[model samples]
Target: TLQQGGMWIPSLLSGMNETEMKNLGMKISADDIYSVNHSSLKDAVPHFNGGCTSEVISPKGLILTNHHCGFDAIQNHSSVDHDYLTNGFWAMKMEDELPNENLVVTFIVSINDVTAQILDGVASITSETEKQNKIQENITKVTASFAKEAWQENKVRTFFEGNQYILFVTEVFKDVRLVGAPPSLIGKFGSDTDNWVWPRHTGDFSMFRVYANKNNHPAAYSKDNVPYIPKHFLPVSLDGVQEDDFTMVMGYPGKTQEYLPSFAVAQIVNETNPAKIEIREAALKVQDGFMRKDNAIKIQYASKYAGVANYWKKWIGESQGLKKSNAIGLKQNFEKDFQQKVIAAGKQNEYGNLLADFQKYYTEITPYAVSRDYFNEVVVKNTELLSLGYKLYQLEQVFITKGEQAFNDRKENLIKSQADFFKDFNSTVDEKVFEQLVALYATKAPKEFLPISVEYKKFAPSIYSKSKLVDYANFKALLSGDAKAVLKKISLDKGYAFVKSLADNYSKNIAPRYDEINLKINALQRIYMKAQLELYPNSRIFPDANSTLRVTYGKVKGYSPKDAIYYNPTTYLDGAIEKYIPGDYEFDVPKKLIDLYNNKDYGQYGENGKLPVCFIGTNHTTGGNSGSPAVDAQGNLIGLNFDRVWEGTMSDIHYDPSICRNVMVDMRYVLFIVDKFAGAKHLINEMKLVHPKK
Candidate 1:
């Protein structure tokens, strides 16, 4: 048996025994980690805004998460005047807390395995299609049947590629509000210049409070709503961690494909990643040029630019790490051994074509995958007007297939969202992005399948000038008439017509072919995953991550990316000052922060006469881990997990324990800013301060 396979941390509520974690330095019992019988660590953490992880820090429901995780809410509440993003915000008084309209935090009440019940009727299905449909039907019934108290919602997710099913019961709190945050200058100190880089000095934490009805039940925004009383909250730790300290990070780690065969890995490391990196790199450069010049444009594009740039840089690192580690070659070596086992076990015929089929389909799928990214990045994301038109294009199809009632309902929702969309959209910037990207799409999209309209050089510029979608007033006006009348009017718009052209060709040609090939590939990957487990029974093969709650443990650790160099597990404000550029957007230092550093006023939160701004650990983490609390061996909150080292971005695909260090802002620095810098002493009084080491 192979030494290990992924070692994906299992969900806490699963069959994990507490002693196994204790062996890895967890002092808490398994029940203390997750127990339906009692309130445990699981009670403290919540799924923040559907994308990031957060934890309760006070009895009054004070939530702690990454500033970027709260970026949208911050942006939503921000204006040029009273810009909390620039100056930061602190509600010293509870009445000053800013209520957000659409934000919600969800607590995972319980998780249970229901594989047998879900797969009950699917065993006799002869076809994969039939099996899939049967499983879907079972899932709906099972999810509905799960008992819920009032506002609890149930969700069922597949793991190990449909080999197992997990059901999660959750409680959602809608009335979440902004509590406290350091300015972008601090929370996003290095911004894109140093995102995903270690030795990070970024104070990436933000605070929010959840509100509920008088009885502490979930409720919408209301003055009548009171601060929710959490069942458990993490006690803030003033005692800083040491090198090799035991650490655990629990969160919903988003998607990962760790079990992909060598062929698939090769395609990503070579073709798909590079193609996307180049495209996004171009878009970011264009956006950056405008963002740097105008403040209004900067505000409009802040979240959007960060969203694009994050993965653009990550893909670059991912490709490099994949190549640096010889990941493809390593996977090939593993596959070679796997093949020998298949032959020895006399199961060659069943799995023999797996690699061959994988290679063939990957080859066939490359062009379409590349085109798909451009469609998403350029048409769906980068260009606002085009994105809006594409929605209208889909609405047209909804009318055709699902008819007028569905069309009317969709129109109302779409128009409402456009108000929100326009607040961040810039026609001039987007038009330029549109023109360049559309032309690039034409040149780079598989020539053999290029749609006729793509060759029309005048297309984008024409649409920008002539399309009513560019004007919010005229756009809303177009949707004012009855469903049939509005549908006819929308179909006739030159811009809407153009998007439909692309959409129609994509549906007719690209997506159908891509889906057909992809279905075969997915079916193959699932069995391939199964074969790996079957062939290497003793290997610790955990299911690939699918944005479920997970607990990953390791130690505070650092690594050398190359020869004759070492990285420490921590960074300080002195380093932040060294990196700061005067009057520069990316690296501007706050005057108050500089003064604090000068005065050596880190107060009680200082470590070894130095204010620890950030630290790194060997704990495994990924995208959705942002804002996850880094808990200690004794379960005290030490830090807030944010990004991982760039060199280990490949951990999403290959978790090399040596280089996969997660970066976190120290709780010391977080409190230093809250208590010392901001002078918000009342907030500190609510926390149970502790020094476990002492």
Candidate 2:
């Protein structure tokens, strides 16, 4: 009951409290929790059956998930000998597949709405912190009680800021194995240049499988492992979705701040992202210089930098859209009117002051907020050492407790595969980026917390101690050296030990500082929310998604990047050929794909020599929707939801159905990769192909 690392019962119940429940106008009983079950499909294309939501598409349990979502598994099975990262892998037969011991996939076994019970007696609160604290306490109590009685193996969670609660009991399957992937040359075909842009063509998907014990319970890898037989799985269709088709996506969408006020949106679009853009742009300039000169930095920061670079690109695009559309002004005007109405109604001081207080903190803390985000979200957390440190802590707990052998087995696999951890890892490059980001944060952040003197002292050694330290040439030498041996030595060294100690110290120190910052941020956020709700109460600002399986609808249409340049819904094999720039990060295309594009070998799904552009249908979604099967009203698979277009990134704050398009890799393209390019006919033969109306 309320045990450490136990089911997330408290979080679920806390989110179901009265204030939030009333805010969202929800009324549900605890007994409603067991009413929902995962849906089933008719065919056997083999769903990846684990991590997110993949179903059995074949009797053998082949699974599907977004390419990025499956990146870790691909990396796990890859090596210098077999570089799955560079050239994707495909196991022709079941036995040939590489097993990823640490990877696991979970299926939603059940979901229950218990909002009414969670918020039984909660009432209005005087302060936000008090409101938050009370809700947390209630959640803990409910969770402990619920876990002790039932659904002990499940993960119960809260969504929509306590407006709705779902008791999700999942069936977690370990021993996930990689089946196949198109080379990044194919999957992530356009890289950042094409990311979040329309008329887009990116495969953006991968395949895997889940295994269980002899008794069919979720278990770790062993020779005795068997395929998981699910109650439901999707039947894959080769006959793809056409324009204006009605589609739906179902998955655990991670988060959506859709209810955010226009003020907050303005701050993020105008102030916050721009500030971050400036810092990251500067850092990248230095990084780009070193990366060009040194191959090692290129390798080390390849993935890490790609993530940051892509985000930066997206932020810029989103910022451009926000500014051009004058979305912030729209939000501000709406907020002003709404506040006037509230004031006229005599509830002036109630929620209005909350908004004012929030704005004050937000304006005052923009610099620190930018610094904190880069330092925490990017630098320290993204490093391998930090990841290893966290993993090691988990290992220690497992080792000391003589816990489940499966867990220990997984830990051993990780330890043995330690060398593999950094095989593609470029430590020297990582160090430079990490140190530079840290230094940037130190310099840019407020003096009270960042303390220039302290930051300089911390950074000076790393910056000036070695000339080629941040240089790729220097990194290559270090990489060639006995990196493992060096790692072993340094891990034990007092100086390195101090580095870890310092990291820990900073983490501890930053927690409260960040908390204070967040409090101020939330305050500003509330003010903005109040203003918006007042001004544009009738505007289509949907509540934050609480993962209760909701849908949004929109039409299929193309977009124009500028006055003359238009992106149609469909791209053709020809576009792939045109965009192909060999070995260039932005426009690189696989030679095999290039040849296919040149040969004009498109299937029936190809229309007018163009690929069908996937669009959103007002279906609300967030991060967890990655790789979600976008299905038409006929319950046929049409497209794979991948990313939201840049203009719609603000969908969380504001839903402009006009621009809020959900990006997808058309199912037809997926089939093309399987049937034409990869020559995986056996896999292709398994799917249910719908014939177009002749």
Candidate 3:
């Protein structure tokens, strides 16, 4: 009765989970994966830049993760002369490694179950707001008093829709540096087109080494600092994966809505996802038109376009996958059964109306939810001028609320950061994007909350012509005067006026009521969660992902995406060669890489004369799982987790073991690229490579 889909908490996987893990072919005990008294696998994995995951692979704290996960750092180090993104970058010597600004990796020192501490006085409080306040107070007290090393910090996280609370002691290392990375031709092979698709040939990996002060504790960047010695580092597996072989992934998965009701799923599929996708699609199309026509525009818009397109494409796939899987229908069926169980257990008073309440609140909040998405997509995110204008709107609010000193400080910061923003900004592209998205927001959003100034054709032209936000020099000049003078100038600007209208409408007409109804939904969800836990004590109901350290295990089995189209679990370097296009952005192959392929210089990193590139596992993973290490049965690193198959993007909401598979770059491919291609054999020498099968 065990399903292959679950993101289990690491510390609690000792008894029943340990048994199930062993049954699924794990050779090690749960203690080997997590232990406070000794070093364990948990010690090796760190949260990458507060978003993705990374694992230490060498004793000197050499870590590895997806290239895209480390893209910001890579991009920051790029220039026309260096062009690290176009040409591969390798630190041939330790002194040559590039240090990144604001890059930090956090390691989980320990996890403690503190459900009782946080919930102690919460149950006695009758006021919903007071209950939450008390809980926060308890969390503050416990966090401050928690036993931890001087360098370690404590943070609290809620799980299972706030049904459980856990505290974590973490160590955040700040001096992570770039060790090496393959060119985009390899690192981001098949960039957008193959992002979430399976049979993936992308070698999506980057290397970094963590450094610390002389004592091997967390410290800021310094030339004197040495490589940090980690408590545990994963051994690289020379023996690669085969079909149905056991695999496990450990990472900090960001979020999932596995417990959402059918009504919620329906809203996401029909209303929210479509609204967001339509807006981002309109903006991306405009940006792409400009980017393709000019190289300067292309360089300027590349990263911006990727950031916007990532979730736009994902939402489109998620909706399709959700619809294809009949997720709403399945959830409806489960709710019916859940209702019956509620009555059977005589817990009707506490849980009987939960589903009905969910339906009512979801229905009530649909318009507001749609409007919120419109405001977010149009004014805050996609369109550059409006997004900048919205920042000005906030600056004005700072004057109104936080006084002139705060306003001046915020103004100075914006002017400083806008240097980079205006460097890449093409007003022509943004004006076009603005025109299209404003049209969508004008017509598609609910009429009740539509901004008064959203007369699409007139708005775009007027704002672009008059708004100082369209250029960097004009923007600084506008903010140069005193706070009152600056505020008056901003108020007169056509772009800021448009954003203010929309922001005011949203704040007045949409957000308050939406949040009010959402809080009610949250309360109901918690109760429903409690009922389900009591009812299904024996079921495999792991908590939904919440950006905490979790472990998901499965096998390396392949599946058919469509009729008569069975995809094998592994993709080889031959597949990459087949997809090669000489000058294409996504599919270009480096000459050295082609020569290695043509000569069949398959080193020790190859198997059966074929160099494997990527593989798929049935492990349930999502965004934050990027850069996670896929370990073998005996705890050896085999693959680096990167993406999920397009057909399984809905696994965040509903995991289907049959179709859901996580894509991983083969560790062999990573090693070959590091040693043979980059000629960085010294980096390879640091790793503890093993023949696990032998």
Candidate 4:
């Protein structure tokens, strides 16, 4: 069995997993990672903003996470005069820390196995619908009755495709504040060019402090609040990683499909990924052209562009890796063995047709799934005018079902929310984007679901010229009247009319069939998962990620991506300087940093006169592992997990230990940026830095 794979649940890792970790060079026991009897590693790690993971590094609750994870709070506070996103912001003093609205961190207090409780009344129910209902009823009852402190809340989540359930007691801190961030030239050094690529030099980290009430409990932000005193904090290690060093990442990984059937893998590799990737490529080209021509437009679209390009690039690499690794072929061969196992176990009637059913449903859902992506990319996400118009379409629905009062309230909310939307919006760029995407939708999308048939080039310009939605002021004027009047006016407008057709078609035709087929597929998947567990009871199997607390462990090792081309495990500051283009947004370096680099002034963080910037490990990680703590053998913070190598982004679907490596900002680099670069030694003073090897 492979030891480097599987995102194992922490509480269940005491025996088989503990023995495996001991063999893999883990010095700490499972109890040191998760314990209800005392403070453990789980107490220091928290879910950041419900997406990324974060770790507490100081007794005073100073937390560390990825810069991109905190980019939203940074960008929100940014303005033309005070651009925190470009220059970076640091709270030099405790009072100087900036409060962020709606930013919260959740700590897992405890985890308990609740499978027996939740499945108590579910076995006798023969109907699938009724069984699910019983399960939900049991979940709610178990959650309410679970033992926990009054301040903590209980949540029940399914694992192994509903074959098991677990309960988590969580403490949510609502008053998280921005503490320090390096300048974009340092933090986002490589930008899109180095996003998921290895041999990376980006710092890719941010600092924030969690605050609580006087009693050290969760509370809303207030002037009387104080820095949170965590139950446990990770001791930072100056002794960095080397080859074959054991490393573990603890985080809330968003999702994965490690057990998907061959048909599903084929659909992603052949149909869905390519279609979405092509659409985003076109959108990015249009936006990039406009952004390069205008500085103001660049600021407006910087985050939006990154958001679109992140998954676009990931999908391209995923498809490539899937092909390179022959993922579908592997799954097909496994299915053949699985069929034999089913017959050998005399369970043919129960599990024999699972693969065939998957094939039928995937073949049935491909066209609908592709069309759904087209509608999402072209109408709801990529094209700005159409996206705004779709909001008005929802407004019309509110009026029809709810009342005129609800409609008017939604209208005012849209106007208020869209003020920021228009600030960065440029119709010229969006118009170009619309033209290209609409053409793709018309020609490539399943034509049976397309709303209209027309020439996209002419259609784009005509709507841009005639629509009130192109400008904020005109849009407000168009919606100035009462509900009846507003409805009539929007109905007559070309932009809203076109959006209405697409939205209506999707709501009426495509989504219903997609949902029906997908439900059956999910049920079959649950059965397949159950059968696999039963047949291969001792196999190396772990539950797929479902936004739950998980621990993944591996070794710090590099890989050969190509023939005779080997990558080292660690990168240095010299690489950042080598990649610097003086005025380029993606590769620019700050003068102060360059000066420090020229002088070899790396302070205590340098290794053999070179500052370790980043390193790669065999740890299996996915999207939500961003900002996860990379712990060494003795449970010390050695680095921060930020990305996976581009060739291994397919790790979500298929994990290949030889090719998949998670990228991390070495702890030494993070300390260098905070203490030496930012000259914020006071923040470093809060931490307990150790040299284990010494």
Model 2 per-residue lDDT tens digits across residues 1-694: 0100001221232333323333432233222222233234312222133324454555456667777767766655555567676788887877777888667666554446666665555556446677667666666665555542232244446654555455655556678788778887677777666777665667888877667777667777886888766555555555655455555555545556755556567778866787677666765665666765765445444455566676677678767777777777776776576567778767766656755765766666665565566545443455344344444434444544665564447554655565554565554555565566556555665555553234355653343234222333432332232324433443453333434554444455555566786876664554545554455544443435544333332334555546787656545556666776767855787777767666767766566566542444344455566777765544456677777776666555555655666777777887777767788777766555665332
Q: What is the TM-score of each predicted model, taking all chains together?
A: 0.97, 0.76, 0.96, 0.95
Residue range 591-619, candidate 1, lDDT tens digits: 99999999888779987679999999888
lDDT of 3 by residue, 16-124 (tens): 8788778889999899999999999999999999889999999998999999887778777776677787787899988899998789999999999999998987885
Predictions in order: lDDT: 0.85, 0.57, 0.90, 0.90
Superposition TM-score, candidate 3 onto the true structure: 0.96
List the candidates ranked by TM-score, beginning with the highest. 1, 3, 4, 2
lDDT, candidate 2, residue 204? 82
Evaluate residue 34 in candidate 4 and report its C-alpha lDDT on the 0 to 100 scale.
94
Among all windows of 10 consecutive residues in model 2, the one with the lowest summed lDDT is: 1-10
Per-prediction tally of clashes: 0, 38, 0, 0
RMSD of each: 1.8, 8.6, 1.8, 2.3
Clashes of 2: 38
Candidate 4 lDDT tens digits, 1-694: 2223789899989878788778889999999999989999999999998889999999999999999888877877777788888888889899999999889999999888999999897786557777887899999999999998888889999998888999999998999999998877787888888889988999998999999999999999998999999999999999888999999999999998988899999999999999999999999999999987876787688778878999999999999999999999988988899999999999989899999999999999989999999988988999999999999998998999999999999999999888878987888899889889988998888877877645453555768987999889999998898899999999999999989888989988999999889888998999998998888878878899988989998889999999999999999999988899998868989888888898899988998899999999988888899999999989999999999998898998999888899999999999998987889999999999999878
